DNA sequence: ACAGGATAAAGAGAGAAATTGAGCCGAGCTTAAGACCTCCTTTACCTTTTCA
């Protein structure tokens, strides 16, 4: 959602501002405090911002190394 | 990008319910020994047959 894009942009801007102010890469807790949000929310945003990798990425393709969901004939 | 506005769908606050497990008990249950009554076996002695 658009609000998520705006949240990610604000997180990037805050991180750059803290890096400029403190002269070093900010930690997760520092960013979470500055954003006034829990660290778990920040990690959730970071995980949801990822781009999906295509199944045909060379490793040979990625799609030939992923098992299938089901009950093993043995089970 | 950023600000405002509308809304619904998904969290926190409390008690009351419902469970829950915990101790502390004696009621239900098992174990073992001994005695003790049916059922059966086998004997000793017969009686009771069919036959030369």
Curated annotation (Swiss-Prot):
Residues 6-75 are annotated as: Sigma-70 factor domain-3. It is found in: Cytoplasm. Interacts transiently with the RNA polymerase catalytic core. Belongs to the sigma-70 factor family. RpoD/SigA subfamily. Sigma factors are initiation factors that promote the attachment of RNA polymerase to specific initiation sites and are then released. This sigma factor is the primary sigma factor during exponential growth. This is RNA polymerase sigma factor SigA1. It comes from Synechococcus elongatus (strain ATCC 33912 / PCC 7942 / FACHB-805).
